[PDB]
Amino acid sequence: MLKYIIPTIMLMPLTWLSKNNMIWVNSTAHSLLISFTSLLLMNQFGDNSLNFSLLFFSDSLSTPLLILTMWLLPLMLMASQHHLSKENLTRKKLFITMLISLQLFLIMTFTAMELILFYILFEATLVPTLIIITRWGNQTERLNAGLYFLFYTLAGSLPLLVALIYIQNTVGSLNFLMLQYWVQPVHNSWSNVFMWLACMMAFMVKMPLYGLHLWLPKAHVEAPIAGSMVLAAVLLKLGGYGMLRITLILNPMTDFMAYPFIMLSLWGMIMTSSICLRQTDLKSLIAYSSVSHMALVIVAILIQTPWSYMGATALMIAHGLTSSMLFCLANSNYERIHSRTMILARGLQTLLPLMATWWLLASLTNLALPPTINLIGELFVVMSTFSWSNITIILMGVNMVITALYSLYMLIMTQRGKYTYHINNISPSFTRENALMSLHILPLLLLTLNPKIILGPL
């Protein structure tokens, strides 16, 4: 990034500098203008490689992943205005500035040129997220969930510093990923277990295994104004990608102990989606979908040898757009009925006809209907771990079975009637309610034409 960070910091003395209620239109206007400039110099060529400027950028060359990070500040301000507009303007100016302040560090992350520039920016978050969790929620179990969001992420990430500083004075210096041409291999020892294990375990705490997922239906269940950092917290989970930067090199020959991470995350996949069909909180229904087919990448990274990196990259931004919109489907239809209980919202599909398509074309991407960005992602993972052992088609096939019965159970609960109650629920899904529900499927099915833009090196 030459200057993408330099205009997006200039967004920040624009909000408080403005007038009265113009502060919504002034921020969303200029924030869309970066989306040309974000595309502009990037997506260049392309054959080994694009080192970009200096010690501040390797341009996120083979993993683009960053254009999606820049949609969101002009996607969340139109989403958050539903129940925020009762507070003071002095705090309404705050909640826009820390949200930009979350996008600032993510921009120097994903590119980062190093491994120690990564960590200090990998941990430069979690302060502006925690402010959106504790203040601006609903009734309690915010505060323990504000502490479960810490102390998993921070307990794991401190043994990175013990190992990353250990590499910096062992073999040259880690400062470049392109001074990683000289790499000594890492054999089987009793100290080289822990060098592999401490460097890996801090990434498992964000993209969860079946164990230690205990913080993920805490922060997403009790959640800000209209999914306002919940859209950010789904990117941030897939923004722990850096295992793709590390483990491709830098102990390349330890598959010897991959097996307690395979079987835990391959049997957990078939169970943690099965454990959600009896959910009664609607925002906790989606929160376990995000566990399951995110954890398919963990058996797609540790199994090396691409035709998996074809798919493991496409799955990071598969439900980057899907699981964002599902939260937006549930951040809407809560402004009208004030419960997230899935029982209560019946009698629907007659009252709001125009958003019936927005339910289905969401839930038709988990069924995934092969010409999308989804079953071009899974069917490379399926054809990859087939070549590990043939038996893995069974568990991953039953993964495809249960999530078919799982996604429709959220659709079919709205196809009932007679509504019994509800003198409220009048608002016929206004112009904003369809606009921020659009711009999700409009790039999602568009990129299926030429999805060579979404591919690794590979």
Ligand X SMILES: CCCCCCCCCCCCCCCCCC(=O)OC[C@H](COP(=O)([O-])OCC(O)COP(=O)([O-])OC[C@@H](COC(=O)CCCCCCCCCCCCCCCCC)OC(=O)CCCCCCCCCCCCCCCCC)OC(=O)CCCCCCCCCCCCCCCCC
Closer CB to ligand 3PE, 200 or 232, in the complex:
200
Nearest to 112 by CA among 5, 269, 228, 265: 5
Q: Which of ligand 3PE, ligand X, other proteins, none does residue 260 bind (CB under 5 to 8 Å by kind)?
A: other proteins
Q: Which of ligand X, other proteins, ligand 3PE, none does residue 198 bind (CB under 5 to 8 Å by kind)?
A: ligand 3PE
Closer CB to other proteins, 16 or 421, in the complex:
421
Please report, for residues 89, 111, 205, 233, 397, the alpha-carbon distance to residue 312 in angstroms, rounded to integers and kept in the order given.
43, 18, 19, 19, 17
Closer CB to ligand 3PE, 133 or 200, in the complex:
200
Beta bridge partners of 341: 281
Q: For the chain, after which residues does the C atom lie more than 2.5 Å from the next written residue's N, i.e. where is it broken?
A: none
CB of 407 to other proteins, least distance (A): 16
Beta bridge partners of 281: 341
CB of 59 to ligand X, least distance (A): 18
Please report, for residues 4, 9, 169, 175, the alpha-carbon distance to residue 116 in angstroms, rounded to integers and kept in the order given.
21, 23, 13, 7
Q: Write b or e for each residue in 236-259: b if 16 or more Cβ atoms lie within 10 A of its Cβ, otherwise e.
A: bbbbebbbbbbbeebbeebeeebe
Residue 269 to residue 81: CA distance in whole angstroms: 36
Q: Which of ligand 3PE, other proteins, ligand X, none does residue 447 bind (CB under 5 to 8 Å by kind)?
A: ligand X
Q: Which of other proteins, ligand X, ligand 3PE, none does residue 449 bind (CB under 5 to 8 Å by kind)?
A: ligand X
Closer CB to ligand 3PE, 159 or 457, in the complex:
159
CB of 64 to ligand X, least distance (A): 10
CB of 443 to ligand X, least distance (A): 6
What are the residues binding ligand X (CB under 6 A)?
Answer: 443, 446-447, 449-450
What are the residues binding other proteins (CB under 8 A)?
Answer: 47-48, 139, 141, 179, 181-183, 211-214, 248-249, 252, 259-260, 262-264, 266-267, 272, 275, 278, 280-281, 304-307, 309, 337-339, 341, 343-344, 350-351, 387-391, 416-418, 420-424, 426-428, 457
Would you say the C-alpha torsion 9, 203, 330, 360 has a positive or negative sign? positive
Please report, for residues 112, 242, 374, 419, the alpha-carbon distance to residue 165 in angstroms, rounded to integers and kept in the order given.
17, 17, 39, 62
Q: Which of ligand 3PE, other proteins, ligand X, none does residue 417 bind (CB under 5 to 8 Å by kind)?
A: other proteins
